[PDB]
Amino acid sequence: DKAALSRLFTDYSLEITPKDVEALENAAHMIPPGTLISVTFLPGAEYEDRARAAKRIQELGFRPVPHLSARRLIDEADLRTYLDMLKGVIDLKHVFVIAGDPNEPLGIYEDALALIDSGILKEYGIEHCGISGYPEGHPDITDEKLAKAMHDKVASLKRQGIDYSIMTQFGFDAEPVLEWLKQIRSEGIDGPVRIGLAGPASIKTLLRFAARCGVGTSAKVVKKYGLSITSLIGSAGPDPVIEDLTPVLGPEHGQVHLHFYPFGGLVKTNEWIVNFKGKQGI
Numbered sequence: 001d002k003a004a005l006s007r008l009f010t011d012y013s014l015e016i017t018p019k020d021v022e023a024l025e026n027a028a029h030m031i032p033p034g035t036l037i038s039v040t041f042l043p044g045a046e047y048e049d050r051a052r053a054a055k056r057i058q059e060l061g062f063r064p065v066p067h068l069s070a071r072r073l074i075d076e077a078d079l080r081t082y083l084d085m086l087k088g089v090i091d092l093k094h095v096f097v098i099a100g101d102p103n104e105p106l107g108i109y110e111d112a113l114a115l116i117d118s119g120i121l122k123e124y125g126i127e128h129c130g131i132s133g134y135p136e137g138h139p140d141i142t143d144e145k146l147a148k149a150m151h152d153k154v155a156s157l158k159r160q161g162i163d164y165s166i167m168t169q170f171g172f173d174a175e176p177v178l179e180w181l182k183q184i185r186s187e188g189i190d191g192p193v194r195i196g197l198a199g200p201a202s203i204k205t206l207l208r209f210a211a212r213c214g215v216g217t218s219a220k221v222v223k224k225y226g227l228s229i230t231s232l233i234g235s236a237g238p239d240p241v242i243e244d245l246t247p248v249l250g251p252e253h254g255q256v257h258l259h260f261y262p263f264g265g266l267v268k269t270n271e272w273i274v275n276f277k278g279k280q281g282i
């Protein structure tokens with residue numbers, strides 16, 4: 001259905017790392033102006049690397065969304081270093097706040113709530129704060145703690161007058177995404193959601209990131225998505241999830257868009273998006 005597919009693909013977003021600025025310039029011509037492009041907060045980059053990438057996103061006509069990784073920050077002064085530097089070069093209106101992967105925080109922020117609820121985002125004029133969602137749960141956090149954190153972060157942003165959205169962990173199956181969308185809307189969370197999708201990539205790369213991010217690969221999912229090490233193709237794209245979601249999304253799911261992780265490369269990911277949309281007639 002072209003209508004349901006166009007709604008899902010409306011205002012789709014991208015993630016880049018600070019190492020991807022040249023690839024972004026090579027892909028920019030394929031990217032709709034104003035596209036939201038997030039910037040990871042992971043080891044191997046300094047603040048100026050991250051700010052440079054955010055500034056390039058804006059200059060190319062897109063909207064940067066810097067990630068803030070709470071457990072990777074020492075103190076408020078450390079976080080302000082990054083926010084000050086961002087604010088001087090970009091229209092700092094959108095951030096995405098996560099706890100961060102280390103099992104031990106480096107500083108005063110134990111999780112995304114600690115950062116969000118400190119007030120620092122309002123002080124810098126942030127209007128939109130994204131938070132995480134895990135349709136398949138999390139290897140180190142209970143479903144209960146995941147749900148309470150979502151509630152508490154939403155309540156904190158509501159208290160502060162800052163809009164929120166959710167971007168989900170990528171997955172290889174539409175069923176847990178559809179069931180989790182029901183659960184969170186049943187729990188009162190009605191804000192916009194972006195379903196994370198792994199871009200087209202080699203099966204080895206997909207299994208690698210999936211293992212490193214704790215994303216499940218059951219036997220039935222390996223068969224349906226096409227993630228066998230015996231594959232004759234050797235690569236896989238997210239069309240099986242998209243084609244399973246598109247007929248089944250309805251009004252009760254609220255606003256539901258897509259977020260692509262370009263694990264196979266940014267140019268390759270955007271080519272796939274353009275070609276997929278063309279094949280489907282949207």
Ligand SMILES: Cc1cc2nc3c(=O)[nH]c(=O)nc-3n(C[C@H](O)[C@H](O)[C@H](O)COP(=O)(O)OP(=O)(O)OC[C@H]3O[C@@H](n4cnc5c(N)ncnc54)[C@H](O)[C@@H]3O)c2cc1C
Pocket residue numbers: 039040041042067069097098099100101102103104110111112113132133140141145146149150167168169170196
């Ligand atoms: C879209 C998306 C983007 C991401 N981007 C980044 C990124 O740029 N950089 C990065 O470092 N990580 C990133 N992550 C990963 C994220 O940091 C980890 O999944 C982390 O383990 C959980 O973060 P969270 O914000 O979901 O946790 P929160 O919602 O802040 O925490 C949920 C609950 O679990 C508790 N908790 C938090 N961490 C742990 C832990 N390790 N063990 C036990 N309890 C815990 C919290 O106190 C809270 O009670 C991203 C994840 C997603 C889905």
